[PDB]
Enzyme design. Structure first.
Site, PDB file in Angstrom:
ATOM      1  N   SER A 197      41.409  43.457  37.082  1.00 18.90           N
ATOM      2  CA  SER A 197      39.919  44.295  36.458  1.00 18.90           C
ATOM      3  C   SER A 197      40.719  45.037  35.215  1.00 18.90           C
ATOM      4  O   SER A 197      41.393  44.707  35.210  1.00 18.90           O
ATOM      5  CB  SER A 197      39.575  44.837  37.412  1.00 18.90           C
ATOM      6  N   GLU A 324      32.522  36.329  38.689  1.00 19.61           N
ATOM      7  CA  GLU A 324      33.396  37.387  38.470  1.00 19.61           C
ATOM      8  C   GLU A 324      31.841  38.514  39.123  1.00 19.61           C
ATOM      9  O   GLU A 324      33.175  39.698  39.600  1.00 19.61           O
ATOM     10  CB  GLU A 324      33.852  37.773  37.283  1.00 19.61           C
ATOM     11  N   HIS A 437      35.396  38.387  42.233  1.00 21.24           N
ATOM     12  CA  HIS A 437      36.098  39.532  41.325  1.00 21.24           C
ATOM     13  C   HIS A 437      37.006  40.252  42.688  1.00 21.24           C
ATOM     14  O   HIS A 437      36.682  41.183  42.990  1.00 21.24           O
ATOM     15  CB  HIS A 437      35.514  40.370  40.071  1.00 21.24           C
TER      16      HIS A 437
END
Ligand SMILES: [Hg+2]
Ligand SMILES: [Hg+2]
Ligand SMILES: [Hg+2]
Ligand SMILES: [Hg+2]
Lengths: 527, 527
Positions: A197, A324, A437
């Protein structure tokens, strides 16, 4: 003496933590920068003044002040990411898990946590590198950095609060790792920085920033890349958000110094409470105080750099996860709910697209909708749900990553791209969110290994495969010791990272990313 | 007396033509308007002054002056469409195939030929309604009309050459059919006008034009619709092309009258030679002199009409063919060749898209390319070829038709939509062109019936099914006597018209047409 190590910074008394069937040296909480408390709030980090006497590195450091996530109290899926130690501004401390017997010089792996720059803890359970360092004989150090306003308030003009300060914290963490990892058995010239991330974006913002290019060897970017919409803001935008936060906390915005003085007086929480009140547009996957393109840390627009090949050329292993966007919709998009199949209606699908592409004008939203809508079933709850899971996914993480991978690959010394499409059988989040994600980490960090967390044996396998891919890459610069194809702009091979026999595919979400990376912005500029 | 018929226009001596196992009355070449020769060139058609003595209607009339197609000399595929009688400006004559024994009053079917308004003959072999009139007991009359400059030169201001004149010829043809078809055994209040390409667009331009709405009962539009890019031009554009043609033939363009005088002096051929020199943009599926939106024939923009439901509400049976664009690419797009698989390269695919969407700005072309490009194989010769076969197909014939069908259906008394996806087994054109635009006619006109043209029995079947669908519709207003679904804006059912068991589908090329009919133009207006 195994646990006691002497470093240029001072002697540090570590601890021996049990791992798998054995034990491992663990030096937790070594300071790497002077506590950014007091009048240093927002100010760049000063290195850590050498201490004297052993620094007790047996207990996890505090976590930087960050927005806790009460959206699902006690729910692991959310809590697993919340700071699990007493938050404090005095949080700039790194952690080092060193194999036992301590290597003489082995691969070093520095981890930079994610959390869209507003959150993050190096102490999280899934970040416990004890299994990675152990299983892979690698010295793993996970640093910490100021997140949110505290580390990213960018009143460009001033020096009292220039941006990317928290990005500097990572550099300081990396600098110390460069100067002292040898004392831990780490090869300072074989330090691979990996992150996910925002971490996968920070790592990437070090591959770009001239100042950092020398403090590491390779880079592993998971579900991140510096060129992400949410990962950066112009110096002006950051200034705007800086005065806006100031406005929200009712500060004298007459000057950077008065503003900054005011902000430096607010308790950590005063900032965290109103820090979301500064985004310029109702959105999803967008964070307030994020790395500013200052011209100092970042010489120019990451695109100009990416274009001109103005970056550290090395081998990078990067990848994205199937779903995601799911996590961001479920939290900020209407119609999604943890407890329901979240079969988003059309009226809400378009509310999704508005939130996902907050910059897009009507035509923008139209083009996005055109690409993601089924049109032969433009009302299907599921299709609309998954459609958004992609608009948000592709737009925010996959496409910018495909850009960076492609632009970098035309200059770097090797790219290995994966597509993690595996829903951890023991996941606690809704099945609809799918491969979420940030859920490949628990694999990268060998969690499936510990039986207590009960993953199917098949996943323990995947874990070890992933950790070896990572480690072997950190050491050799190639994930391989079947063959994980190199990513080349010509063929664009990448692999699936699942429990199934590692297959090879080409051109991750290409049709979409062409629209995202080539058409959409071109449309937006014209209209 | 069977062959000799008396009409309001005069007595007309027909001929008895053999058809299938029998014979049939055929009245070929009945004038319906005074020969538009002399100083009437471009001028609206005057009705045919009543003659005296039987008008010998035993031999096909001349064909209006039109651009012959030498692109493949002697090649049936092309020649089958070229005027097969001596071209003459004196071509305004209709043909009537009347069942034997002559009905007392049966369904009437008027056919309006295609050919993008620049070509067309009512005498073509595949237009020989002898099999339709016979097999379906219907009185079929195929009219003729001025094509090209001769019938569509639109110097709006003037009356000496106002546009849509050739569209008026069709009305005159329809008026006569209304007044005299009874004498042939035709039910004037059950006259279905059917046409293909420009004919299917003309038919539709009669459903709109107030002047024509009363001269027919229903409409069958094959691969056509009035709202097509190529089917209409603004009064200004037509004026432009009128002066440009004038320029090409070196005329005094100082005034409509001098221009018109000049043009009226040029032999038919002088106009046909340079008539392509007036298109405003290098393109494909675009014709010079085409129906102008005058405000007289067409009260307003066909869209404003279509929107306001300002049209004749009746039942229309309309449809498109799988490969509408193939014929136009093969003739005006590079890379396509009759004798080669025409595996268009990428460099040419984009040359295709330029020609198909001549109005599109770069972004336009970009959006088009984005939708039609494979992106996971953006170099595939085949994929690029077929991609264009669709850009041209959808953009020019399918999408505008899906618009008209949808906009009309919200007011008409029933819509039946088909998708002819059948490559006549005895086709002479390349297999890659597939189901070619204009190749469903030979079926609609029962050609498979004649064994000499040798179609597989399975196709003779399809022919009869199609002709019955047409006839039964012309009579009842419903193609059915399994069930051919009505087209409703809610469900959008339509059927495949092939030798396979008639299946039902919904929303013809929807994903595309939404982009064509909703996004593309919206993009183009914004950019
Ligand atoms: Hg990224
Ligand atoms: Hg290994
Ligand atoms: Hg049309
Ligand atoms: Hg029939």
């Amino acid at each position: 003496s195994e646990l006691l190590v002497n470093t240029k910074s001072g002697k540090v008394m570590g601890t021996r933590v049990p791992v798998l069937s054995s034990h491992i040296s663990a030096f937790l909480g070594i300071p790497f920068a002077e506590p950014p408390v007091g009048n240093m709030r927002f100010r760049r980090p000063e290195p850590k003044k050498p201490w004297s006497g052993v620094w007790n590195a047996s207990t996890y450091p505090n976590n930087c002040q960050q927005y806790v996530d009460e959206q699902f109290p006690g729910f692991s899926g959310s809590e697993m990411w919340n700071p699990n130690r007493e938050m404090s501004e005095d949080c700039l401390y790194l952690n080092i898990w060193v194999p036992s017997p301590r290597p003489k010089s082995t691969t070093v792996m520095v981890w930079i946590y994610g959390g869209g720059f507003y959150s993050g803890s190096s102490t999280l359970d899934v970040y416990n590198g004890k299994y990675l360092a152990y299983t892979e004989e690698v010295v793993l150090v996970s640093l910490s950095y100021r997140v949110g306003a505290f580390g990213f308030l960018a009143l460009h003009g001033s020096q009292e609060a220039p941006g990317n300060v928290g990005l500097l914290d990572q550099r300081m963490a990396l600098q110390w790792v460069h100067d002292n990892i040898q004392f831990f058995g780490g090869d300072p010239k074989t330090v691979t920085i990996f992150g996910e991330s925002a971490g996968g974006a920070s790592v990437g913002m070090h591959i770009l920033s001239p100042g950092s290019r020398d403090l590491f060897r390779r880079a592993i970017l998971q579900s991140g890349s510096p060129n992400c919409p949410w990962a950066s803001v112009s110096v002006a935008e950051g200034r705007r958000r800086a005065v806006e936060l100031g406005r929200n906390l009712n500060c004298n915005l007459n000057s950077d110094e008065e503003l900054i003085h005011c902000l430096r007086e607010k308790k950590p929480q005063e900032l965290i409470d109103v820090e979301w009140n500064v985004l310029p547009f109702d959105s999803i996957f967008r964070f307030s105080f994020v790395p500013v393109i200052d011209g100092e840390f970042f010489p120019t627009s990451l695109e100009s750099m990416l274009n001109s090949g103005n970056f550290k050329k090395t081998q990078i292993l990067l990848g994205v996860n199937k779903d995601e966007g799911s996590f961001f919709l479920l939290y900020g998009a209407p119609g999604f709910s943890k407890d329901s199949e979240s079969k988003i209606s059309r009226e809400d699908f378009m509310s999704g697209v508005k939130l996902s592409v907050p910059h897009a004008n009507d035509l923008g939203l139209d083009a996005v909708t055109l690409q993601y809508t089924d049109w032969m079933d433009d009302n299907n709850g599921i299709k609309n749900r998954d459609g958004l899971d992609d608009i948000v996914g592709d737009h925010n993480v996959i496409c910018p990553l495909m850009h960076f991978v492609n632009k970098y690959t035309k200059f770097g010394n090797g790219t290995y791209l994966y597509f993690f499409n595996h829903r951890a059988s023991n996941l606690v989040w809704p099945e609809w969110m799918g491969v979420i994600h940030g859920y490949e980490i628990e694999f990268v960090f060998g969690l499936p290994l510990v039986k207590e967390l009960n993953y199917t044996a098949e996943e323990e396998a995947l874990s070890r495969r992933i950790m070896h891919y990572w480690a072997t890459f950190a050491k050799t610069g190639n994930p391989n010791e079947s063959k994980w194809p190199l990513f080349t702009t010509k063929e664009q091979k990448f692999i699936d990272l699942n429990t199934e026999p590692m297959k090879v595919h080409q051109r991750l979400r290409v049709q979409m990313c062409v629209f995202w990376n080539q058409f959409l912005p071109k449309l937006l500029n014209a209209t």
